[PDB]
Design a protein around this ligand. Structure first.
Ligand SMILES: CC(=O)SCCNC(=O)CCNC(=O)[C@H](O)C(C)(C)COP(=O)(O)OP(=O)(O)OC[C@H]1O[C@@H](n2cnc3c(N)ncnc32)[C@H](O)[C@@H]1OP(=O)(O)O
Ligand SMILES: OCCc1c[nH]c2ccccc12
Ligand SMILES: OCCc1c[nH]c2ccccc12
Ligand SMILES: OCCc1c[nH]c2ccccc12
Length: 213
């Protein structure tokens, strides 16, 4: 049997298994990744492992011990009064991944989640969410998300922030009790005067989603 599954804290020694799962699914089937045909992307591998030592990322593991879902989260801190805002895309050599990092930089230049919550110093950031295709539609995304609420409660974190790359994923977060705090249509994202991302019409654009727990 493959069911039931558990939800467990991701450990540093899980890095290779996490990357293997993401390469099978997220790298190929997150909408922007598939639109670009990301391919091999060691920089996304490194990006995905970065939040693990924050000790608040979760894996769904089936009855055979295989990872069938992950939600990789990191703590984000309010920029210091003397902050030097850096563009993440400036340190990326992979051209396709750079386009995604540039989109993230653009969102952050237009919208600062910390402006919404002036009293908060630390906010949980949901960075990478992926569920194995054969296990989709079972509520695993919600159970991964709910495990983060436990971490938030234990540590007095009030806000969970998730940048969603498609209305499809934003709708999942809405079902889980998140609400939109910022949006941008792909048709309106023209950093150098021209559209960069043209996925299918139902995706629409990015929505930053937030929940206060
Ligand atoms: C911060 C970020 O990572 S943003 C990018 C988010 N990740 C991606 O886009 C990667 C590709 N997508 C996925 O991995 C998954 O679709 C996820 C993680 C978004 C959702 O995971 P799931 O555990 O399937 O979520 P859930 O069980 O709530 O199903 C969501 C919706 O998918 C639909 N769905 C239903 N059955 C299936 C199925 N077999 N396969 C795919 N979708 C299904 C339903 O519309 C369902 O909503 P509903 O059950 O409330 O009616
Ligand atoms: O918040 C953005 C989530 C995301 C969508 N596509 C990606 C590719 C690499 C890393 C993160 C993302
Ligand atoms: O191919 C679309 C992949 C997808 C991304 N987010 C979702 C949410 C629900 C169902 C499918 C998706
Ligand atoms: O259902 C689509 C709702 C929507 C309106 N404007 C947007 C911009 C980005 C993502 C989604 C939307």
């Amino acid at each position: 049997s493959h069911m039931p599954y558990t939800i467990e804290l991701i450990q540093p020694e899980d890095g290779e298994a996490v990357i293997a799962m993401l390469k099978t699914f997220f790298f190929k089937d997150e909408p922007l990744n598939t639109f670009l045909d990301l391919g091999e992307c060691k920089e996304l591998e490194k990006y995905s492992l970065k939040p693990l030592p924050d000790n608040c990322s979760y894996k769904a593991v089936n009855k055979k011990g295989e990872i069938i879902g992950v939600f990789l989260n990191g703590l984000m801190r309010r920029p210091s009064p003397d902050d030097v805002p850096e563009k993440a895309a400036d340190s990326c050599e992979h051209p396709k991944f750079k386009k995604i990092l540039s989109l993230m930089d653009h969102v952050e230049e237009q919208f600062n989640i910390f402006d919404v919550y002036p009293d908060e110093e630390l906010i949980l950031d949901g960075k990478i969410l992926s569920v194995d295709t054969n296990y989709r539609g079972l509520g695993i995304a919600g159970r991964l998300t709910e495990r983060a609420y436990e971490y938030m409660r234990e540590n007095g974190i009030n806000v969970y922030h998730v940048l969603c790359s498609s209305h499809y994923s934003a709708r999942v977060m809405e079902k889980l009790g998140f609400h939109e705090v910022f949006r941008m249509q792909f048709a309106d994202y023209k950093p150098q005067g021209e559209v960069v991302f043209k996925p299918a019409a139902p995706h629409v654009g990015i929505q930053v989603m937030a929940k206060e727990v």
